[PDB]
């Protein structure tokens, strides 16, 4: 019945792209109307910080409040493996709740990116699928996108990362395009962002014979 805490990591792209700002989110649900006051204590490697910000309080319309505190983290602080502890104190709580998150521990491994053309059997259909194999990477935090002629291709689907037998992760991304676009020689590119890549980025291109 009492409040519960959910501590969330930053989005992979936010930590991988220097032009973005990564942040950890401490979410508290089941906050009673009687005692909506929530005290936040933030810690980085055991050292308390004070630059956190409280999001607007929210009614969940099931007679509870949703109190959220956000802490901006540095790109390399997160990439080096610093742990972020969120301590939530409430008077409807017997003891304050502590949650700790960080980047998944383990040596970072560079993803291998290979593109596959559509089968000639698939050339009889209205649309063809371009495949992007990304394997042998760790941690599982990754961003995979498609593009063509400086413009993003949004008609794709990507499987979740799958734990391989060697301890690394792999996945597949499938971009589906009109066959005519493939026959006309247009070049399509598979973008992969990962911390173990050079400049957190690589690109593999693929086109017709």
């Amino acid at each position: 019945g009492g409040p519960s805490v959910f501590l969330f990591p930053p989005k992979p792209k936010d930590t991988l792209m220097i032009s973005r700002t990564p942040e950890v989110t401490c979410v508290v649900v089941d906050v009673s109307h009687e005692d909506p006051e929530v005290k936040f204590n933030w810690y980085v490697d055991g050292v308390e910080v004070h630059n956190a910000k409280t999001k607007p309080r929210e009614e969940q319309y099931n007679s509870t409040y949703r109190v959220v505190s956000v802490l901006t983290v540095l790109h390399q602080d997160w990439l080096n493996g610093k742990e972020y502890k969120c301590k939530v104190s409430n008077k409807a709580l017997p003891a304050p709740i502590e949650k700790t998150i960080s980047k998944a521990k383990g040596q970072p491994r560079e993803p291998q990116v290979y593109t596959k053309p559509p089968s000639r059997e698939e050339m009889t259909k209205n649309q063809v699928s371009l495949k992007c194999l990304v394997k042998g990477f760790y941690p599982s935090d990754i961003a995979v996108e498609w593009e063509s002629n400086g413009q993003p291709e949004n008609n794709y689907k990507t499987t979740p990362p799958v734990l391989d037998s060697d301890g690394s992760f792999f996945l597949y991304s499938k971009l589906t395009v009109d066959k005519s676009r493939w026959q006309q020689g247009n070049v399509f590119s598979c973008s992969v962002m990962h911390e173990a890549l050079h400049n957190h980025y690589t690109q593999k291109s693929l086109s017709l014979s």
Partner: peptide
């Protein structure tokens, strides 16, 4: 050198 993604700066070493 640096890496770019659709105009947005990714990372530089």
């Amino acid at each position: 050198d640096c890496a770019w993604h659709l105009g947005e700066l990714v990372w530089c070493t």
